[PDB]
Nucleic acid binder design. Sequence first.
RNA 1: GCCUGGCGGCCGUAGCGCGGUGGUCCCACCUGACCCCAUGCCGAACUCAGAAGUGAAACGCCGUAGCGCCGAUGGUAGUGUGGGGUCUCCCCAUGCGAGAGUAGGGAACUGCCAGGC
RNA 2: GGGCGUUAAGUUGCAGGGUAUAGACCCGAAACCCGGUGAUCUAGCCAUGGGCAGGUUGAAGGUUGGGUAACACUAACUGGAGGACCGAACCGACUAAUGUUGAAAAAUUAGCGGAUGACUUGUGGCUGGGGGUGAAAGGCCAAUCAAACCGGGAGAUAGCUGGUUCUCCCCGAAAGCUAUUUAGGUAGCGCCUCGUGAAUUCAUCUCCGGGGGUAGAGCACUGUUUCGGCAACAACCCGAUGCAAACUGCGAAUACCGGAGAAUGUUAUCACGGGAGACACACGGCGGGUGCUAACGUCCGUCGUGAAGAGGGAAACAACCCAGACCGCCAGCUAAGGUCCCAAAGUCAUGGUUAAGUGGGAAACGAUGUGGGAAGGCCCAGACAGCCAGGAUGUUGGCUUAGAAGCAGCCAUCAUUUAAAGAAAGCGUAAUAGCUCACUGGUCGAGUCGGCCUGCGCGGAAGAU
RNA 3: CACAGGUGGUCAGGUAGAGAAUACCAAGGCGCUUGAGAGAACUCGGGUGAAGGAACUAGGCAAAAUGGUGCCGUAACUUC
RNA 4: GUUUAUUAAAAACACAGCACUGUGCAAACACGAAAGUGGACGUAUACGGUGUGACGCCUGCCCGGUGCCGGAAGGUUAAUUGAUGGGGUUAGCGCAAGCGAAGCUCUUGAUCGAAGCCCCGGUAAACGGCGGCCGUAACUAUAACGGUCCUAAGGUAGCGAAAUUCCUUGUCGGGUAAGUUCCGACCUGCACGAAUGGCGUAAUGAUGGCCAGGCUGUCUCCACCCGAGACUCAGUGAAAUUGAACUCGCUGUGAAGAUGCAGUGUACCCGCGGCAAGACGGAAAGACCCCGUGAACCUUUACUAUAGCUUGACACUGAACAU
RNA 5: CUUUAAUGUUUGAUGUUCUAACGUUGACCCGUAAUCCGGGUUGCGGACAGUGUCUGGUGGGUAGUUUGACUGGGGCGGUCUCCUCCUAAAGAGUAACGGAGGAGCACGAAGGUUGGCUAAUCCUGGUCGGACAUCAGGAGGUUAGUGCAAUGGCAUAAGCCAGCUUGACUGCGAGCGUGACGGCGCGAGCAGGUGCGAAAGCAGGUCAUAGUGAUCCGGUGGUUCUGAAUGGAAGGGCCAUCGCUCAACGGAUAAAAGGUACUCCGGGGAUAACAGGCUGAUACCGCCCAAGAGUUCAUAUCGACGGCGGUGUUUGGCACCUCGAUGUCGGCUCAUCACAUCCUGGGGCUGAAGUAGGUCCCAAGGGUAUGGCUGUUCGCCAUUUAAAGUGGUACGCGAGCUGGGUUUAGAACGUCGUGAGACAGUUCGGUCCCUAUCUGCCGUGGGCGCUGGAGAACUGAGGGGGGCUGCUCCUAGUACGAGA
Lengths: 79, 185
Amino acid sequence: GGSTRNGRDSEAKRLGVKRFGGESVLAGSIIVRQRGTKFHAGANVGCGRDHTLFAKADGKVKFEVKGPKNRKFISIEAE
Amino acid sequence: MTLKELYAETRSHMQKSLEVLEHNLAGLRTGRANPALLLHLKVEYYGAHVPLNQIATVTAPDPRTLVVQSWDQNALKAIEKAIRDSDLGLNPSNKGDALYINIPPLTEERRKDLVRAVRQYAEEGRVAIRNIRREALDKLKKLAKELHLSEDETKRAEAEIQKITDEFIAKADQLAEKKEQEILG
RNA sequence: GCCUGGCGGCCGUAGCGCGGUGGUCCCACCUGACCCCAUGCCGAACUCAGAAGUGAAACGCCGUAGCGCCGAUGGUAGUGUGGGGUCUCCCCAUGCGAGAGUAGGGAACUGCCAGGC
RNA sequence: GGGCGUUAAGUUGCAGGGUAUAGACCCGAAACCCGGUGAUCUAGCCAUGGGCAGGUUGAAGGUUGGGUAACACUAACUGGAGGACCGAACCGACUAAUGUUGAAAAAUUAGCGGAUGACUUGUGGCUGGGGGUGAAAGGCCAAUCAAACCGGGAGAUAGCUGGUUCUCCCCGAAAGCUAUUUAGGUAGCGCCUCGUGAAUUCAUCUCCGGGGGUAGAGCACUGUUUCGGCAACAACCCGAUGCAAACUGCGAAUACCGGAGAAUGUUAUCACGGGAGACACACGGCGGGUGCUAACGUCCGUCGUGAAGAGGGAAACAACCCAGACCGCCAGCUAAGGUCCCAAAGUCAUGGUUAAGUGGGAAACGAUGUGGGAAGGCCCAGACAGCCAGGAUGUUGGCUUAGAAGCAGCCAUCAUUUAAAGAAAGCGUAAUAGCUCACUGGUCGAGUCGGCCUGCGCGGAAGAU
RNA sequence: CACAGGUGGUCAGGUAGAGAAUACCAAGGCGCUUGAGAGAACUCGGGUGAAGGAACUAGGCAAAAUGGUGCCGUAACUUC
RNA sequence: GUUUAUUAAAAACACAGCACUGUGCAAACACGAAAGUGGACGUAUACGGUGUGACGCCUGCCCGGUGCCGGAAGGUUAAUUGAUGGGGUUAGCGCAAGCGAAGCUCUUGAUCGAAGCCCCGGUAAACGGCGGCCGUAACUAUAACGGUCCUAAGGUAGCGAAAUUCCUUGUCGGGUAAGUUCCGACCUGCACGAAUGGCGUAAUGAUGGCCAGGCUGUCUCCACCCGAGACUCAGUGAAAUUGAACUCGCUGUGAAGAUGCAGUGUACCCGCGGCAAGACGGAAAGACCCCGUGAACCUUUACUAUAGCUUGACACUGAACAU
RNA sequence: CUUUAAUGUUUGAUGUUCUAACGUUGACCCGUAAUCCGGGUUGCGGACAGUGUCUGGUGGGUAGUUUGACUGGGGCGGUCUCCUCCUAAAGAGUAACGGAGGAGCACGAAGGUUGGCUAAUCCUGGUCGGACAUCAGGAGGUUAGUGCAAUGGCAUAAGCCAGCUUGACUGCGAGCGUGACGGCGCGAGCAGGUGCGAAAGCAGGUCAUAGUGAUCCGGUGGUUCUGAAUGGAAGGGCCAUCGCUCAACGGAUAAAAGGUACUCCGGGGAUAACAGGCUGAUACCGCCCAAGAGUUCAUAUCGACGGCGGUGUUUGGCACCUCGAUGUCGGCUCAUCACAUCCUGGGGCUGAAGUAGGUCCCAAGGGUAUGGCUGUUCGCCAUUUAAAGUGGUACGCGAGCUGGGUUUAGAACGUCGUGAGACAGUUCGGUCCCUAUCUGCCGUGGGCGCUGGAGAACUGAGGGGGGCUGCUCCUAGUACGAGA
Ligand SMILES: CN[C@@H]1[C@@H](O)[C@@H](O[C@@H]2[C@@H](O)[C@H](O[C@H]3O[C@H](CN)CC[C@H]3N)[C@@H](N)C[C@H]2N)OC[C@]1(C)O
Ligand SMILES: [Mg+2]
Ligand SMILES: [Mg+2]
Ligand SMILES: [Mg+2]
Ligand SMILES: [Mg+2]
Ligand SMILES: [Mg+2]
Ligand SMILES: [Mg+2]
Ligand SMILES: [Mg+2]
Ligand SMILES: [Mg+2]
Ligand SMILES: [Mg+2]
Ligand SMILES: [Mg+2]
Ligand SMILES: [Mg+2]
Ligand SMILES: [Mg+2]
Ligand SMILES: [Mg+2]
Ligand SMILES: [Mg+2]
Ligand SMILES: [Mg+2]
Ligand SMILES: [Mg+2]
Ligand SMILES: [Mg+2]
Ligand SMILES: [Mg+2]
Ligand SMILES: [Mg+2]
Ligand SMILES: [Mg+2]
Ligand SMILES: [Mg+2]
Ligand SMILES: [Mg+2]
Ligand SMILES: [Mg+2]
Ligand SMILES: [Mg+2]
Ligand SMILES: [Mg+2]
Ligand SMILES: [Mg+2]
Ligand SMILES: [Mg+2]
Ligand SMILES: [Mg+2]
Ligand SMILES: [Mg+2]
Ligand SMILES: [Mg+2]
Ligand SMILES: [Mg+2]
Ligand SMILES: [Mg+2]
Ligand SMILES: [Mg+2]
Ligand SMILES: [Mg+2]
Ligand SMILES: [Mg+2]
Ligand SMILES: [Mg+2]
Ligand SMILES: [Mg+2]
Ligand SMILES: [Mg+2]
Ligand SMILES: [Mg+2]
Ligand SMILES: [Mg+2]
Ligand SMILES: [Mg+2]
Ligand SMILES: [Mg+2]
Ligand SMILES: [Mg+2]
Ligand SMILES: [Mg+2]
Ligand SMILES: [Mg+2]
């Protein structure tokens, strides 16, 4: 009694693990409530309201680490 | 104020009432084979009336003789001067560190007054205990109605209540029965 | 090749502490301040015009292991597939194999330009 | 720019799959509505006739006498009332038995109630169905009543139940998700079938590229927890030890996502469209919530099986082990499991254990059972057991206690004499006494004592044909 | 149903009796449309029981008992 | 007396008596769409309705809620009347913009408007209600007594462990050898209480409970006996049920209680009379339980309607006069 | 004419009088040797009453209906939508009536942008300042803070301050994420115009993830879209937007509470009750350690704190078998098994003098009470007894008996409900069916077989029946005992 309830779906993860077809703008990661869990960088960026790693122009997902104090950092180079 | 708390409450109140029972019982002269008889006997000493026990020792060597041992001699004297002053009509004997109080076979009249006292007290007790339930129950009705307890929860509570009551009644029953045997022995 | 400044690389064996050391080259601090511009007070910081002064501080170096940090070999836990014994647990075959800890490492290493010797 | 479109071959018959409206596969309600038929049963009432053997009680009124001023009042006799009394007929129905496929769809038998009355009965009439009638039970209204019966609306409706008829061939599920006055129904999605299209598409293995915070571990963080260190008892902090689903400065296996490649796989794959059924799952393995790490329990994840799978195995056993049945064969080999007989195959070989019918049910704990492996201690300055001797003094230690003298209890537990001798190990006394014990000397003449690592047994172990 | 049920009115003999109760008979009408044996447990309907007497049982259920006329006599209570 | 024809005869209904209330006659009411009819050829000592239920002693407190009775001054309010303002259109005025009468129209609702409701007073033999908390006396325990919270009022007389009492076999007394029943009490009345009457009460009762005497096969504890079946014979001649029967015990197994599976034990074949332990025996698609966007009656301040009752407007429907 | 009165007149309110409608269930006449009906006369009442259309109130008298679901049977209690975490086995996702919490909003700034700033806490030192007000230094390092849950994030700070503002803009949208769907979310960039800044740029609301309602039906503003002969207009469309704790939150109606024991129908053992089963926490029984009491003395007898089992036997849990019916408790009747033995039989220990006991072990042959009270079983009591055992057997036993309890229909009380009705409260009353085919028992025959057929008499493999016990005397008033 008076103990239940729960949220819902809300994925928030990687939808483009490593290099991908990465169209004009997929996601490669929608882990909202973040900035450092997946820092914006390289050709890719955006990171809209819901901290969703936008990912600009086409290419390939990178997944970095560059930058003082760890810091994930993602970007999308080309082939 | 919870079901459990109330539970502890009923048990408590009944414990107090039961204790009053023992108070009345021991305050009586069975076949007078009981040492508790003179326990509450507060005697004058140092300006105050100290309850005999905190001044002497009352033991029943045999069913026909009660003894009051007092570490203090002066207290022993004043103790005897207190074992009487009542319907007890006990005559303390001065010999050593204690008092020898022969329990004369009890008259049939005093036997009357005594057994009856045991019954009147017994029922009195029951009454209290029963009423205690009555109250506890009401409190339960207001509880289940207030906290919204499933018919099963509330009834269950009732069961617990009755249980407590029944036990105590049993306690008052025994005390009354044993005390009686003493008076009839 | 020495030293320094700016910009980055890489982000702890690159950090912290402790001691030595460098200077009117470069940095500092510093002089002054109506003025540009500045203080919810203050030329403290920002900002400007610049002596004298000095490396104190800050900083840049050198040594130093007390505190971080890195870290095996081996052994342990766990585990994918197969199999076996059992009350919840574990064993064997076989790949994978931490963590913690031990040995030890360790007082960064770099590229571009500029300025002095 | 983005959406919808752009030589998209249509269309009309015939056969068929589907759907809609209809009874729509078939059989079935309880009911609802309309129009009639019924008071020859029963319930009231109306009109008119009939009936109650016998026996009893004795009211009111009356007459005479008493009495009264007169009335009250009184006593005899007379009289003959009454939902009055007893009790046949008659009416009823309180009890029991028997009957219960009866003699009988309510009776028979032995008892029972009323019996001049709110009585009982024959005859005919009047009340009609949501209506009647009812000394009120929801009772009676034709063996029917919380709305009679007959015919019709009418094949009411039935997300429910049952059942659904010839043969062979190919494929072959689901018991899930999400919605639902939804929960045993439904609808889109999922899974099946069939057709039409499409690319190394899809799968497994190899390598390459990724993020990860589970197992595990750890204790900086959030809590929890000990033990020590600086706190007129403890926070903080220092170090040493643990704990966590909602702890993480560490971190697997692993799955998953993507790239490339070999082989293999009667396109396995993707899309569109016709046809479905299904949306109770069950067991077992592993990861788990709950529940008692209870249940042939319940709820998720995931795999296998059954469901929808026979055969062999486990005695017998949908799920578990093996293994997927096109058919015929009096052939051969194997899986699982087996090889003394029932009963197909070794009374097989080698070394060892076990002795309880363990095998072929069960724990904590208990015991010179017993097989193996390493290791220690004491000992011919005689070990180990038994046997002979000893075990004293201060002191009855102090306290306590009625007493406590080795032996209720508390404290102390030394010293002296020695070959040895506890302020004493148990029994015992009221307390002493007394007995045995430690330990010591001699005897005895070669090993003895317990632990450790492991294997097999024993007890503990009581149930109903 | 060739069914132990239901069905109104009329008549009213003799003995005993209060009697249309009941018992035996008159007139009158009948033996009930399967019979014969046997003489079990047990069911059914009954008769009788030593001693005891409600011990039965939910309960005296059911049985047993009581029974008539005249006279004697009859309590609490009472609306007499 | 009456009643569940066919499990309930009662403590139920009914009744004489009581009380309330409606009813002025063309009565109230009831049947009927209506005409009309019963009430009643009655007329308030009469008739209807409701509740109580001889008789005796009685019948307290509450009108806050609901209903009913009386008042309606004021507040609100139906149909109705339609003042008033807004709009469509268009003659004309105007390159035009826009303006716009009249008429026809769509809309607006002033104003008028009864009962009802609010409101005001009453009504309990109307429906219906009638309390909590704390303190105190010279044994103690107890509390007439005081105080405190709140009611529409706080249950009076009487009665109480009762057809009401859960705890419960309350405690006490009587009966008994022993009494969860019974009788008499106490009062702590879970949760009596005064006409949905309280307490009594002679007589009555196929009424509930308790006790006794008598009586007995009711029983201890059955035994005998007379008759009807049962049994044998002769004639006629059913029934339910029924997948197929070659229709054993046990122990296990198993859709979880086996004649049929496994293991085992046992057992020549078939009748007749008896018994009922099993065939989850026979009989009725469980009446309990739950489900169905099932059913039927029933209640009511569930909803939406409606007969009836009652309001006012206009109509049938007219003439005057006062204010 | 305006503000007021008078007379004319009109008309509205109340109120009186009148007759001529309308009524008359007064009287009389005729129809007519009528009680209806009609016409007439007279009296009464009289525009009232009454009826029609409309209309406000009242209206369980009646009528059609509603009155949810999940639910470890139903009910009760709770829940129903959205957000956060764990359950979630390191991608997404995943259940319970699992464990914990929040939301139904707040903001014209708490939005934007530019520029600047950085905490918490402690120590030390300071008027009042003290535990903690403000000030100075040091340590410290984000442990603060973030509008509100939880999570994650945040120093380039979202955290904090100020200046200027309206990007909380309009039209669109490469491409993705997520859903059955309806939808929902992210979005660089393009066009138009804005704001901040020198500028590079940033701004399509807030750190983000909750702060929610489809459709229909209408309301309002805009628009040459439409406009039924045509011109208009009404209305419809289109765009903007408003209205529902429709919260049972995919929202059946605008509108809905209940009772049934008077009940009924279709279904379910998909689902409770009984008894079987699985289980065995609980229950009963046994064992482990032994602090304690037992004078002393742990284990004669007993045992704390805690440990482990066994049984199927209680209280339960599950819902596997029966809901096209498996009759419930108690009694009666007749049993049958178990042994955790009550009696009797044999023993060990004793805190066993004896006689009597206490406790453990063995043992299932046989035996193991009548009444009172209640329906009871149980239980309490009276009196017996060698003893009055415990339990399995569908809590053995209804196709064997009863029918007292207990669940139909009657009725009543207390009680609750406006009420119908209701109660695991009470009270008085309340139809108990079956001829046995199969098994199995119990008895009794008919066959055939046992190797020629008989009449007999035995043997005895097996099987069953029966197995109780008191008291008195003698031993011996002895052993024993101080005596008793
Ligand atoms: C509990 N028993 C009580 C007893 O204690 C006594 O109680 C009264 C109580 O009834 C009074 O109460 C009275 O006054 C109240 C306003 N003050 C309103 C109620 C009214 N009865 C009290 N004022 C005084 C008590 N001693 O008298 C009545 C009684 C019933 O016997
Ligand atoms: Mg008769
Ligand atoms: Mg009679
Ligand atoms: Mg007739
Ligand atoms: Mg039709
Ligand atoms: Mg049909
Ligand atoms: Mg772990
Ligand atoms: Mg995973
Ligand atoms: Mg479903
Ligand atoms: Mg399902
Ligand atoms: Mg499942
Ligand atoms: Mg299961
Ligand atoms: Mg063989
Ligand atoms: Mg064995
Ligand atoms: Mg005949
Ligand atoms: Mg015949
Ligand atoms: Mg006799
Ligand atoms: Mg009788
Ligand atoms: Mg009847
Ligand atoms: Mg009857
Ligand atoms: Mg009455
Ligand atoms: Mg009465
Ligand atoms: Mg009254
Ligand atoms: Mg009484
Ligand atoms: Mg008796
Ligand atoms: Mg015959
Ligand atoms: Mg024959
Ligand atoms: Mg069996
Ligand atoms: Mg029979
Ligand atoms: Mg049957
Ligand atoms: Mg059924
Ligand atoms: Mg209705
Ligand atoms: Mg309908
Ligand atoms: Mg439901
Ligand atoms: Mg996950
Ligand atoms: Mg926010
Ligand atoms: Mg919903
Ligand atoms: Mg049914
Ligand atoms: Mg089931
Ligand atoms: Mg059960
Ligand atoms: Mg069963
Ligand atoms: Mg034994
Ligand atoms: Mg008896
Ligand atoms: Mg008994
Ligand atoms: Mg029967
Ligand atoms: Mg009964």
